[PDB]
Write a protein that binds this ligand. Sequence first.
Ligand SMILES: N[C@H](CCC[C@H](N)C(=O)O)C(=O)O
Lengths: 167, 167
Amino acid sequence: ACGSIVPRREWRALASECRERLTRPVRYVVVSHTAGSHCDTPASCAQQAQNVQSYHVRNLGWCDVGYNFLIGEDGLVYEGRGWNIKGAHAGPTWNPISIGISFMGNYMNRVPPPRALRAAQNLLACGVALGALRSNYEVKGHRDVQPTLSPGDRLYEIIQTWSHYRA
Amino acid sequence: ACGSIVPRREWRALASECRERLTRPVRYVVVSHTAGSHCDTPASCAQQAQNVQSYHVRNLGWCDVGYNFLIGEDGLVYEGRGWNIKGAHAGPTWNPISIGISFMGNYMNRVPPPRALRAAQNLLACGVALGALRSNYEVKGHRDVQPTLSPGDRLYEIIQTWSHYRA
Ligand SMILES: N[C@H](CCC[C@H](N)C(=O)O)C(=O)O
């Protein structure tokens, strides 16, 4: 088990119905925030991934949670659509050429804790390590590719300092 | 770099006074339990890591927490002595030739949750990737190399199914 990713079944996900595959290795990573509630325990962040997926599935009518992975302030990564299934998180130009990771919260006036950030970068290395990502992958913030405040001012200024970030 | 580890400072560890280095690559991994209180959040697990360190330093007179790494039921790994410094967790024959990882809890009547187990296994893969552990490393229960009940019956039964387990 590559990163220490919480599997779909462990956060009680509805089964996915998405079919569209991403072509590896993938070039881009897009970092979003959920603009949802935050959580900082495994129990609270499992519920929160449930809740986000529930909105996407029941309400937006999507095949699964839109993000490939979610990050909790518990410092764990929650399997969304995964490495191999095209996401619904950054519009039609970016969904097919990226992995979308989303921090569970609103980081406009808040920073995610260092454990959340470590879990994100550990996830990405793990992606390289598996061949899901390019070794020279490029990180975009959600607002760099779509009109939105996502991932929040505070979170966005941090991912700007990441070695793989490209505006 | 590899994995995600909660660093010493983040859990508010006393400065280490330990100096003896292990010789890489290390061949053996010894898995214990602390036989202490469990914790299932980053906040409670950081506290617990302090308590364990406090006990070993202040009461037992050791140079640091005895373990190289601790595992919380929050699903995070807590930095102890690290990959490079000799632990105090398995006696004078095993301490110089092993990495000691301890699950924070009492696993006599109780299993650690899948996320603790994942954190532990991934940690070891990272030791391998790092050259800290041999690729053909062996995992031992604490009871395999010393008389005590550690790492606890339930947890012992689990580590017996790990692919690197050798009695
Ligand atoms: N490569 C990872 C280990 C994960 C196992 C992965 N190789 C798989 O079987 O999918 C690492 O060293 O962090």
